[PDB]
Design a protein around this ligand. Sequence first.
Ligand SMILES: [Mg+2]
Ligand SMILES: [Mg+2]
Length: 278
Amino acid sequence: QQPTKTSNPNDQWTIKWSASDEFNKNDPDWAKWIKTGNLPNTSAWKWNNQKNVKISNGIAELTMRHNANNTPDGGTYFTSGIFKSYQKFTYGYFEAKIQGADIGEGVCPSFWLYSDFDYSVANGETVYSEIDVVELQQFDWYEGHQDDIYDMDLNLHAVVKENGQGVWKRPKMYPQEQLNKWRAPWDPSKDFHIYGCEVNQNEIIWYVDGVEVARKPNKYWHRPMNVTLSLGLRKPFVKFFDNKNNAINPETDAKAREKLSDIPTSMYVDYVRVWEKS
Ligand SMILES: [Mg+2]
Ligand SMILES: [Mg+2]
């Protein structure tokens, strides 16, 4: 198999099985994907891959579940599921075929690449690199525009060392360099579509169903990153302050309580494929 669409047909692409999976096996491949431990810091929910990852008939299912009895675990009320490659990559092509979640608003099916934090690097250097190949169903609010289910985000995030500190460079702070939004003509929660990203030393280009939808210069995104599919929690179950999702107790908020009838909810992934340019 090859990348659906690339910027230069003269390039050659070699599939990298260390972060590619057609999910034809019902036993998740925990040699390839990190089951526990080394998973993203989430302040608003926890991961439970034993309970929240299932694969059936060629399709992986990642599920957001409400904790039994509404009992917090370390300040959080839900668990989710995540495929995080052990293998890191920097440049290459990354693609996943994904269908979103039936809840509509409240979770964020995501395909994304992220590094560790290296706070040792020199002034101006990158501490942390994150490329979001797609964030679905976030219902983001930006400059007075409220998104709905058809809108998606395709953003870059980094932390850069400045005057001794790691300073976050966020998409809404640097939108020309880092923010991408695209509106689909179909509801991403209802069917599978193909989300791709081509990453090289110069540029990062994003594709949806084989159409280029965004491109940005590669300013900071040169660190090794793990290939990630995960189902994130969003409002009404979280509330933003201090540059982080804070968990909301779904029994203390009407909007969160009424969405509980729609939990558990799942994203689905037919494949993930990674290539390197040869
Ligand atoms: Mg299967
Ligand atoms: Mg499959």
